[PDB]
Amino acid sequence: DVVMTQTPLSLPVSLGDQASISCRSSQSLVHSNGNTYLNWYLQKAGQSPKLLIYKVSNRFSGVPDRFSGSGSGTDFTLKISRVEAEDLGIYFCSQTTHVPPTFGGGTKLEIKR
């Protein structure tokens, strides 16, 4: 199946810095029609699932411009302008190109000390 290199594992940043979660793939997640299939995820302690981007960069209806997704067909990253206190938590990503869909991710965004 298609592999996905998830990185980094941890992201000790400061409240105000920038972010860049990486989510690579073995092959291009581009379909014959030219459509891409990859989404991002974010979770806290025990709240409902959160979605920032569902299509490479396409943000969800409610996601501030602070969050941006981009990269090549074999590279996807979650960049954040200013990592605030709400951005903290756990991040993940997934693809909807192959079946079963391959899931991955786990970047721990915790503030340094």
Q: What is the dihedral of CA 46, 52, 55, 56, to 10 degrees?
A: -110
Cα separation values, 7 from 16, 32, 56, 65, 78, Å: 21, 28, 17, 22, 11
**Strand pairing report for 89-95 and 67-70:** unpaired
Ordered by where they begin, the domains of the chain are 1-113 (2.60.40.10)
Confirm if 82 and 71 have CB atoms less than 8 A apart. no
Rounded to 5 degrees, what are φ and ψ at 59?
-80, 160
d(CA 54, CA 83): 20
Confirm if 79 and 20 have CB atoms less than 8 A apart. yes
